[PDB]
Design a protein around this nucleic acid. Structure first.
Ligand SMILES: [Mg+2]
Ligand SMILES: [Mg+2]
Ligand SMILES: [Mg+2]
Ligand SMILES: [Mg+2]
Ligand SMILES: [Mg+2]
Ligand SMILES: [Mg+2]
Lengths: 83, 83, 81, 79, 82, 79
DNA sequence: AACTATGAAACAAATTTTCCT
DNA sequence: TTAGGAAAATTTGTTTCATAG
DNA sequence: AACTATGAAACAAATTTTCCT
DNA sequence: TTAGGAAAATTTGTTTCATAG
């Protein structure tokens, strides 16, 4: 098994960008990771922690609260900075 | 953390070829893996199983019993076949 | 062509492979339970497994004759295991 | 009991010229797996029937309970 | 060159940060124990950590002037952490 | 209480011009870590001494046990 | 080809915040 | 009104990776 | 650029074998 | 001499990866 050659930030952005409304709940993001790569079908304690850490740490990922909870979105302009 | 871009057989051969007498016990091979790459400092249940599996499966790795137990060696001619 | 297996050949196998060369009905049932469970696989599964075994085990050698390709068994390399 | 290796050997071993193409091995496995699928729900009664029908299977009653044995001479007479 | 810390400023910090602005001697000791344990780090450790924090937190802005580059604190940006 | 951020901020805030080069921050941390290393075995007695020496620290005896408080007015004079 | 130095990423954790029994 | 638990977030400090010199 | 087919590798496990309490 | 335990080996069958076509 090989981990994808992309950063967590890039992968998370990919997940969100591929969604129909450009937004995903945390659990939906986890699902995208496990469905897409074999690497994420094990050691969940490690990679899910990485995902949450990246979502909070990086300003390009903005939590948008809504009636049923909250979804994560991507501030593309922000994502582009430093990259 | 990234796993080395080499097969288990290639890494095992490397460990043995670097030893002073071209022989290593199983525990010494585990130690070479952990000392050499961060990747092998976690999920021991998985990679140690991989190492034992590779040692038995591939004919290029020959167990040589000795007074103190047994060491693993490499049949270079064999390793070269299929490669 | 003779069937690969029959209840008779299977019952004989169960008994012959046993310790005392004897089995109670319940023991024969246990053996059959395990055996039928093993075969409850699909073509996609066994087909993959067959190719895997032919290219992994040395006892299986492919002899190319005036037909295309045929696999044979090296009994001497088969016994060692 | 069975492994793909023993099965592949059985197929090849039980064929004249002791050879088989990959397609022929596939055919043998198809027949074999079909057999077990077809009889997955009948083997219990089939076994009881065979035990009492064929003389090669002899019931030996010992201390506690009874056991079944094979009369190899009788068995080898069927073929 | 007044010291960055003195027992006096530390004792006051422990008491001021407390719930009811008052601590027993033992509570002050517990605070000091934790504090001294935090600082038991080597130069290789804190040096790395300092560079890490300067380039991670936006409240720390490098204002490049005349010669060399000096940092500074964005009191407002630091407000979030407050 | 303390994080590298609060410390870096403390250093810069206590400096003139409220600015510091990376080397100056390094100097401040060197002095700071040196302080805690130097006094790792003396702080218990040092704390007891300071509490009874400085009037800004007042011992208030309530129901069970006694607690220490800071007389903010007194503390500020000396600064 | 080695080796060092170093920021971005990755990691491992300790805490916090919310929503529910 | 608290007490806990699980998710979800937020934070901190350390280790690893990729590479410019 | 996509997609399929497929052998090598990688995985996950069930068992075995040895050496010691 | 039987009963585990753990490390070391051996085995089997399934999933993943890289890539020819
Ligand atoms: Mg964010
Ligand atoms: Mg071997
Ligand atoms: Mg082979
Ligand atoms: Mg009969
Ligand atoms: Mg920053
Ligand atoms: Mg006093």
């Amino acid at each position: 098994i090989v981990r994808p050659p992309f950063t967590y930030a890039t992968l998370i952005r990919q997940a969100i960008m591929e969604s129909s409304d450009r937004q995903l709940t945390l659990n939906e993001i986890y699902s995208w990771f496990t469905r897409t790569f074999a690497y994420f079908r094990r050691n969940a304690a490690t990679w899910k922690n990485a995902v949450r850490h990246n979502l909070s740490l990086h300003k390009c990922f903005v939590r948008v609260e809504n009636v049923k909870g909250a979804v994560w979105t991507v501030d593309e302009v922000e994502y582009q900075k430093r990259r």
